[PDB]
Amino acid sequence: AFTVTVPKDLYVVEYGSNMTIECKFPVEKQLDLAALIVYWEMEDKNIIQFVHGEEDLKVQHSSYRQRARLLKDQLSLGNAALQITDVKLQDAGVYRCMISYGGADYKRITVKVNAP
Template sequence: MASIGQIIFGSMIFLIVIISGLIILILAIAFSVSQGLVESRSPSTVGNLAEDVVLDCRFLSNSGNEQFSDVSITWQKDSLSGVVYEYKKKAAQLQSQNPQFKNRAELFSNAISIGNASLLLRNVKLEDEGVYRCTISASKVSGTTSVNLRVVAFSAPTFTLQSNGSLFAQAHKWFPQPEVRWLSQSGQLLNSSTQFTNNTAGIIQVTSVLEDPVKDQDTYTCLIQNSLVKAISEATVTANKVTGRTYFMFSAASTKVPSLQLLLTVIFILSAIQ
């Protein structure tokens, strides 16, 4: 049976371990705060093939309103040699730029001083897909954030009213292959037929026909959707003419780990040690 002295000694050791762990955690948090904030407001981004996309990266000092004069910005892509883009001493440093991004990547130079390190990537290609990392080094701010870029192809359909009263829709650019549905003005699923035609690059042209006869002054919805993009197109028939409008919704899993989740994980590990 342990003596009172042994119990007290063991309790003191236990308390020292717990307090030391808490001090280390507090210092780690304080150190990270002292480095300011580097983050992306869009850690998962969808790019449309052959169009431009912006990979968001922002940095902020503790004061929150500082103008930055000496900033180093490096964009890299995982599993790819060289840099995507590098900015130092108020100028682009592209000696080690990967050839994949030559004349296609740039920063918003006029906005760097206010904490905008976002990357503009022109003419997006399928091989551009991947995880990009934005690293910032500036006065009172340093850190890295990541952006997961997914590349797809999507376009809005054009509508034509055919002589037999059916409604015809054609979208020239989709990848991967989507599903197509038609809905009535009340949201009812309608009869339709759809064809997919691949070009030499594997991009898909979507041709779909609403087989049910349409009514004047009614609005019909054509939904074209794959795993990442949904095109919601509304076609209104008026006096044998069709007017259409389309808006897009995007779905991409975030790769960013919330700081609160990370803190809770650390606390759980410390409690497990106890």
Template sequence: MSVHSFYFKRSSSSSLWTLILCSALTVWTPVQGEVLVIGSNLPIIAAPGDDVILPCHLEPMFDVRGLTVEWSQPDLKPDPSDRLRRVEYVHLYRDMREVPDMKLASYFRRTELFMDDLKHGNISLKILNVSEEDSGRYRCFIPKLRSRVKAAIVQLVVDPNFTKTSTTETPLHHRNLQTPDPQDVTPGNAGLSTASVVVIVVAFISVAAFVAYFSHRLHLKQTKHPEDETQKQPLPV
């Protein structure tokens, strides 16, 4: 093998290593520090007449007082008799106040946000005096949030046979529970936690370094400098 080929392979190996590092940084950068809307993977179960809290918050903590917060029922279809077919909400927070005009009549005076906690990113919804008709999926959504995960789904089950052994007011923050709405997640690694991305990146770099190191050692063994070959040849008698 010629010296030119040897240095060409070394250059190619170096370029490959640079590409791997750039790719790893590209994967990590958009996710680091991104604010996500977090819901609950577990259903909230209550008995008729209970007051319940549908947990939803932003992580890391983020002040949402100046943003719009929408709570709706995604499985509830608009009334076909309504010419405007406007969207009606379980609860709508806009311009730093509740907007009752676009609220479903069945939830009038029955829903509220924790206004003092909005600055901490808590957008959980409290529903008073629930009934079986309230069962279903609820969607918390922040349309102007600069994130790839702007919404989450919370399931409410109102069961007349449910025996309340503890308060149905679920803790406001669930660090280990996340249910992003698939419609509001950008394809890719948006659903991965920061820790998961770190593990993937570290594993990827480790494997790449391992392969690059042994590839380089193999090239050194298979390719020798012409001067070394000359020195190893026996001297003429």
């Protein structure tokens, strides 16, 4: 019965505005590193690769480096919160996340940028 919910399927943020997107998963009070694996993607681009407490920076995509970080503290709560600072038009698209803690599931999130 391990399913993983998103709050909202569509985020609509302006250019330059900092964004953060969420993926709520079940946690049994406390959290285990050896169990937890998290991943983020947008059109086959490595955004986050988090394996039991190991973000490798080389593996991340070149056009995401000083901007796309996952909030570490948020995972204690039971939420993979991916942050982007200084949003671009280029970042607009469909964002996959994948999570494995006990069970496993994934979800897609549409992201559409604006520009005044």
